[PDB]
């Protein structure tokens, strides 16, 4: 649900959003869409501050649900002890 189903449309980006800002929305939308289905969980200058506010909160929450409900880190260490 990460590699596909999301495409940055180069044609319909408004001029008043820089090409880098358009990759922070495609990443906040994907971070919430993936948090619901697969993870199985449910919950200008002020404009630039809104994107970053929606970034430094959603992503920081995605790791918490991915380290407490699934222990993503505890598998990396365990996948070195045995498989390596």
């Amino acid at each position: 649900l990460w590699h596909d189903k999301y495409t940055l449309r180069k044609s319909m980006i408004p001029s008043f959003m820089t090409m880098d800002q358009s990759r922070k929305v495609l990443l906040i939308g994907k971070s919430i869409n993936f948090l619901h289905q697969v993870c199985h969980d449910q919950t200008e200058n002020a404009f630039q501050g809104k994107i970053d506010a929606a970034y430094f909160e959603t992503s920081k929450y995605l790791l918490d649900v991915l380290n407490k409900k699934y222990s993503l880190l505890d598998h990396m260490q365990a996948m070195r002890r045995y498989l390596l």
């Binding site: 619901h36 289905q37 199985h40 449910q42």
Partner: protein, 154 residues
């Protein structure tokens, strides 16, 4: 005793949740507080959604499912003691109390090597009853619940 339908079931609905529905209901019809109204608000809420989102349809079903299952386990073990009943099945079905059978075999032996007739069905229920008393097992409970059968004439 209800069933499920597949030839009429919707397309986008998976069979997994369909099975979940079939169990959460039959567990009520057979079974004849706050866990009743709150869910009604949840179901009504979905009726307001202008787009059917399966990813949410399950988060309300599974909670309802886990609540009745948690409520049913409370009765199937604590109130209606399953351990005692399983302890009965292991003893008699699976020959757990083998000491009862070596005496029953010792007595009800000649009356079974002959081919079976219409009378042998009662000729053993007594011998089995003579057995439980022969091993000083005195319990009017669970004693008449055990009835040996004779598959005769077919």
């Amino acid at each position: 005793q209800f069933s499920l339908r597949v030839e009429i079931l919707p397309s986008y609905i998976p069979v997994r949740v369909a099975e979940k529905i079939l169990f959460v209901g039959e567990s009520v019809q057979m079974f004849e507080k706050n866990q009743e109204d709150t869910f009604a608000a949840e179901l009504h809420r979905l009726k307001q959604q202008p787009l059917f989102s399966l990813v949410d349809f399950e988060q309300v079903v599974d909670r309802i499912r886990s609540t009745v299952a948690e409520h049913l386990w409370k009765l199937m073990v604590e109130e209606s003691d399953l351990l005692g009943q399983l302890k009965i099945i292991k003893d008699f079905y699976l020959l757990g109390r083998g000491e009862l059978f070596q005496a029953f075999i010792d007595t009800a032996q000649h009356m079974l090597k002959t081919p079976p007739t219409a009378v042998t069905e009662h000729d053993v229920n007594v011998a089995f009853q003579q057995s439980a008393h022969k091993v000083l097992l005195d319990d009017d409970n669970l004693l008449p619940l055990l009835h040996l059968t004779i598959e005769y004439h077919g």
